[PDB]
Design an enzyme around this catalytic site. Structure first.
Site, short mmCIF file in Angstrom:
data_model
loop_
_atom_site.label_atom_id
_atom_site.label_comp_id
_atom_site.label_asym_id
_atom_site.label_seq_id
_atom_site.Cartn_x
_atom_site.Cartn_y
_atom_site.Cartn_z
N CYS A 20 -10.81 -1.96 6.72
CA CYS A 20 -11.04 -1.73 5.33
C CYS A 20 -11.81 -2.89 4.78
CB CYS A 20 -9.74 -1.28 4.67
SG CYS A 20 -9.16 -2.19 3.26
N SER A 61 -5.22 11.92 4.79
CA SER A 61 -4.12 11.07 4.49
C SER A 61 -3.47 11.59 3.22
CB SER A 61 -4.66 9.69 4.27
OG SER A 61 -4.46 9.38 2.92
N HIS A 84 -0.92 -5.93 2.97
CA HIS A 84 -0.94 -6.33 1.58
C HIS A 84 -0.20 -7.65 1.33
CE1 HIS A 84 -0.96 -6.24 -2.65
NE2 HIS A 84 0.37 -6.29 -2.69
N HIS A 85 -0.87 -8.58 0.67
CA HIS A 85 -0.32 -9.89 0.39
C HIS A 85 0.30 -10.20 -0.97
CE1 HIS A 85 -2.19 -10.83 4.14
NE2 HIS A 85 -3.26 -10.16 3.72
N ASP A 95 -6.22 -11.64 -2.39
CA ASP A 95 -6.40 -11.75 -0.96
C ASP A 95 -7.51 -12.73 -0.67
OD1 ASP A 95 -4.48 -9.98 -1.17
OD2 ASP A 95 -5.36 -8.34 0.05
#
Lengths: 319, 340
Positions: B106, B227, B44-45, B113
């Site tokens: 993903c 998950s 993640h950015h 992004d």
């Protein structure tokens, strides 16, 4: 006066990606317990002369795997990349390893590469100079705002921010005259290429110095390094035959029949190849011609592990 | 079965970036000590939601730091990077680790992004689908090329050579069904939201299945993943409390991540939301162990899947995050059982 290693990871018909990669890892493990203070990794793409394209990754792996050495990317070509990736990766490395990562970069050498990565050339240098601005901004600010003919996006934070104030230690690789200029202005160290002739390093070296002057920077401190290939055998002919067999492709690749023979003999004589007395002497002259505070050798060509490994201890016991 | 520790590198308002990087490495290490056989990383950015925007590198550090632990990238955002570069990275990873890398991919959720990494916004699925092929091809042939509106580069050699035959194991983090379909068409294992439920899950499966089957795959070996987000404590009340706060934060953070929205910049070219999430703790391992155990078996018994990976960052602190993983290791771990 600091020493260290470096891996080019050249693959051949005799040594494969899997072999080299391991051997490298195998060695980093050994050296760790010695007095070598640094490990560097050579970035190379799409040929047998350097089986690694992402030096930052390997760097992470070795960083994760060692306890003592700084580990650094030798020549990360930022010219063909996205400065952000770069920056994120770099601060990241600095953050995770807590101050044990050093950042050596460089402009793009092989013309092709530049082409393959949509990189036009009319801007090659400026493009380079730029990437660095940014990379550098982030390092110092934790943020960035490009808005250039090269890249434009809104301002952003670049995480993780950076352990080391100002960012990790940086260095540039001495590929062109115009780069050593620029580099000198900002007064930042260089790394002298083992494939360059002693003279070449000299020019550049001097050049740097002259420019460092004329602008203001007090480089009395700056420390540069030099990379050299080591190969010793009590049979000088052998050490020479091995090494040439070893660089053969490198040379046909990079110094396009410019005089394969000429070029080759020269590297064969300028590098630290030979017998101890031959090897050691040559190192010495190289250092003197460019004045490097740090020597990064490479013992790769040595096929027999025991000897190779025996060459390392020797160079180790020196200190 | 298979256990995994899920890590976001979410930054709590009281932890500084450094602090988080440190805790991040400590957990990656402790993982195995806690019975977890794989550590999974989210990418993640530019925001507090995730500080770690380069999973390959991070993966290399932990992979290097360990002998046997496994590491996976829960979500490498496929499109935003160059396939060649990714192939080399996965390949290095695979070869250096000696096959201990899990390549979870993903599609790409935040705009950002893309506006910054300079990638094609709409083509999001195409890209992923295409990038995947090139990479794929490089994975066993040893070469890569293009020829489409996407990229164009000539045949080049690829180093190093894949360690694990055909490349590292690939996983898909899929929510959408166009995507559930995509996977199935190639029969890739997958990761399931922790926001959805039993029926929902079980139902995604079937869908995966009718495809998987139409293409002759054995649904029997495909390893998918459950998950979840976890909160193991004796006081069921604390477990759920703590958890409620986390999701405010998460959610809020999550939302903010739809930031660069002030129009003086063009993505033109040259080179949103769901519904209630605050109650999703009702469908995840939150509360006493007894409560956790049940919630899990339930999804198990309903999907057949034997790989559940959990995220404990919710407990916030480094200590608590541990206790709650040790708790789980002793109190939940033993008590689970395979499918029907």
């Amino acid at each position: 006066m600091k020493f260290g290693l470096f891996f080019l990871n050249f693959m051949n018909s005799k040594r494969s990606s899997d072999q080299v990669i391991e051997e490298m890892l195998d060695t980093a493990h050994y050296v760790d317990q010695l007095k070598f203070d640094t490990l560097a990794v050579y970035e190379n793409h799409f040929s047998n002369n350097g089986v690694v394209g992402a030096p930052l990754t390997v760097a992470g792996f070795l960083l994760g795997m060692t306890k003592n050495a700084k580990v650094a990317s030798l020549n990360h070509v930022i010219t063909t990349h996205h400065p952000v990736r770069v920056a994120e990766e770099a601060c990241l490395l600095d953050q995770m390893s807590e101050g044990r990562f050093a950042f050596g970069f460089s402009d793009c050498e092989k013309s092709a590469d530049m082409r393959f990565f949509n990189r036009p050339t009319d801007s090659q240098f400026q493009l380079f100079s730029e990437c660095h601005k940014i990379i550098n901004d982030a390092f110092t600010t934790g943020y960035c705002h490009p808005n250039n003919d090269f890249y434009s996006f809104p301002k952003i934070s670049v995480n993780p921010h950076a352990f080391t104030e100002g960012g990790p230690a940086q260095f540039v690789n001495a590929t062109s005259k115009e780069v050593v200029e620029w580099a000198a202005k900002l007064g930042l160290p260089l790394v002298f290429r083992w494939d360059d002739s002693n003279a070449q390093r000299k020019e550049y070296a001097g050049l740097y110095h002259e420019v460092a002057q004329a602008h203001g920077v007090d480089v009395s401190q700056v420390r540069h390094k030099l990379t050299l290939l080591v190969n010793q055998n009590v049979d000088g002919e052998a050490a020479r035959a091995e090494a040439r067999v070893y660089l053969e492709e490198f040379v046909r690749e990079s110094y396009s029949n410019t005089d394969f023979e000429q070029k080759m003999g020269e590297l064969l004589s300028e590098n630290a190849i030979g017998t101890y007395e031959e090897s050691t002497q040559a190192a010495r002259v190289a250092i003197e011609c460019c004045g490097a505070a740090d020597l990064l050798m490479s013992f790769e060509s040595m096929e027999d592990k025991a000897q190779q490994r025996a060459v390392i201890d020797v160079v180790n016991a020196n200190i | 079965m298979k256990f995994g520790n899920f890590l976001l590198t979410y930054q709590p308002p009281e932890l500084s970036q450094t602090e988080v990087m440190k805790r991040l490495v400590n957990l990656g290490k402790a993982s195995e000590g806690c019975g977890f056989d794989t550590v999974w990383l989210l990418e993640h950015h530019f925001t507090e939601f995730g500080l770690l925007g380069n999973p390959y590198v991070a993966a290399a550090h932990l992979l290097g730091a360990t002998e046997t632990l496994n590491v996976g990238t829960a979500a490498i955002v496929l499109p935003t990077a160059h396939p060649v570069r990714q192939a080399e990275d996965v390949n290095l990873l695979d070869q250096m680790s000696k096959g201990r890398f899990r390549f979870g991919i993903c599609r790409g959720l935040y705009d950002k992004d893309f506006r910054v990494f300079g990638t094609d916004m709409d083509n999001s699925r195409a890209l992923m689908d295409c990038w995947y092929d090139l990479m794929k091809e490089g994975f066993n042939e040893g070469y890569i090329a293009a020829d489409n509106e996407h990229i164009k580069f000539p045949k080049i050699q690829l180093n190093p050579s894949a360690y694990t035959q055909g490349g590292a194991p690939v996983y898909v983090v899929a929510e959408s069904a166009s995507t559930t379909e995509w996977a199935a068409e190639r029969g890739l294992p997958m990761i399931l939201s922790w926001i959805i439920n039993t029926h929902e899950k079980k139902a995604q499966l079937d869908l995966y299945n009718e495809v998987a089957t139409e293409h002759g795959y054995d649904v029997t070996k495909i390893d998918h993943c459950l998950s979840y987000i976890t909160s193991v404590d004796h006081d069921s009340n604390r477990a759920k409390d703590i958890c409620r706060n986390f999701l405010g934060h998460w959610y809020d953070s999550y939302v903010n991540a739809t930031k660069i929205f002030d129009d003086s910049d063009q993505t033109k070219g040259y080179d949103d939301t769901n519904r209630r999430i605050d109650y999703s703790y009702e469908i995840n391992p939150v509360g006493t162990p007894e409560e956790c155990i049940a919630i899990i078996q339930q999804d198990i018994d309903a999907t057949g899947i034997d790989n559940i990976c959990c995220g404990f960052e919710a407990n916030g602190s480094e200590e608590e995050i541990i206790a709650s993983m040790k708790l789980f290791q002793s109190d939940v771990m033993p008590y689970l059982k395979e499918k029907q």
